[PDB]
Design a protein around this nucleic acid. Sequence first.
RNA 1: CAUGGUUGUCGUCAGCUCGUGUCGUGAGAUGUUGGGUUAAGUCCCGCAACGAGCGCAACCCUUAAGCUUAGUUGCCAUCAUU
Length: 221
Amino acid sequence: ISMKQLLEAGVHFGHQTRRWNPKMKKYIFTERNGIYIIDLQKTVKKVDEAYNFLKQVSEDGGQVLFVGTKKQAQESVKSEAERAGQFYINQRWLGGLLTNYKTISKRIKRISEIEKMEEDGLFEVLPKKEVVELKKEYDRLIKFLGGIRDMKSMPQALFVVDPRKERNAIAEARKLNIPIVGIVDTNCDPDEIDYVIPANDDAIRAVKLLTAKMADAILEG
RNA sequence: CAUGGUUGUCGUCAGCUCGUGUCGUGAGAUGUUGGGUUAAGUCCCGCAACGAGCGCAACCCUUAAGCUUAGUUGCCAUCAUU
Ligand SMILES: [Mg+2]
Ligand SMILES: [Mg+2]
């Protein structure tokens, strides 16, 4: 990536001065109109480092889980994870998705069980109320766990868009020793993320650019 | 007011809990709280919770409309007759 590309995307913006995490002082560049500006040189350096890490893990054969439940990253994370053939979470992170995998896996298998029952002709025999409630359950399961249906083990890396909102994912990943690549905005905590990426998380263009670059890294790996 | 069994009552009020997870030094907590909705912990949304069980609901009985079987001691429509 290039500084001109980042500036065109809008990566430079940050949050107001009223809300801010002083642990990212090194990344803050300047102030403008009661908002902070990120250092794009350090941004590109960290983006290159994250690219290298993601490429190396992909080459080693690990799996990456994308988390973008933020409204400005749902579709971007969805599309980039689909492009890279990886997993994603863009609706809600269920408390215990990784630490309580012993039950989340059963919830995952419920999807395949419902599909098997539907394809085995149990659809019409069951009462109308039963089939409609099963449809509702299947829709909920796809909405929440749709992106990790084929995730049969713990991921080897977690790409998170906005850790401040994705507190749960950060906590579970840190507990389970899963490396994290984060789009850490100004008002976020960099110490939690293993591979920080100073960037504006409120900009659809910026988040899409960064997640696409990471997906390209994974594809190359 | 030593008891079994049986019963009334709040009240058919909507509660009572558990496994895994997570948070707590710990007893514990969460789930089960919040916004709505429902007869209902009923359901949805949200949410470090994810699910499950007993309660709730449903399965049982009866009533309200059809169809198949059966037509006596039930019914009377043609038909004769009382
Ligand atoms: Mg219930
Ligand atoms: Mg009942």
